[PDB]
């Protein structure tokens, strides 16, 4: 019904679609749904610059990204991907001290969702113990599998 409820709901509808929040405690996903900025980009806009010493992560709500990374400064930027709504991109930063490597270019005009590190590491903090050994599990097994498969 309210403007507020749909939003709320929505928001908690895309951090549940992330597949490491999606088991997270319903009071977490709220609680980080409450977190979550709007953000606009132009297109052709860096979202995101190779290399910066990053600290957020990215839902996209409107429009489409692409991520690209620089392989040497004589031939062409390496396209890896481009995303849509819905997809998610720098969730590394989440984790503790990243550097992104890989540039994400808005591709059209793009809504982000997002959440910085400090906001989300307060809220893991306070998991109980068994939700947080969960949480940290599930990241060290997607870890190993990402890095397994190659």
Same mark, same amino acid.
């Given at each position: 019904g309210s403007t507020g409820l749909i939003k709320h709901t929505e928001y908690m509808e895309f951090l549940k679609s992330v597949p490491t929040f999606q088991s997270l405690p319903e009071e977490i996903l709220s609680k980080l749904a409450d977190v979550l900025e709007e953000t606009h980009y132009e297109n052709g806009e860096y979202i995101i610059r190779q290399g910066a010493r990053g600290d957020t992560f990215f839902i996209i709500s409107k429009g489409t990204v692409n991520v690209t990374r620089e @392989?040497?400064?004589?031939? @062409?930027?390496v396209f890896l991907r481009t995303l849509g709504k819905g997809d998610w991109f720098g969730?590394?930063?989440?984790?503790?001290?990243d550097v992104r490597t890989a540039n994400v270019i808005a591709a059209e005009a793009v809504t982000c969702l997002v959440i910085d590190r400090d906001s989300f590491k307060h809220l893991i903090g306070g998991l109980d113990d068994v939700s947080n050994k969960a949480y940290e599990d599930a990241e060290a097994k997607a870890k190993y599998e990402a890095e397994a498969a190659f």
């Open positions: @392989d040497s400064p004589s031939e @062409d930027p969730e590394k930063a989440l984790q503790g001290e």
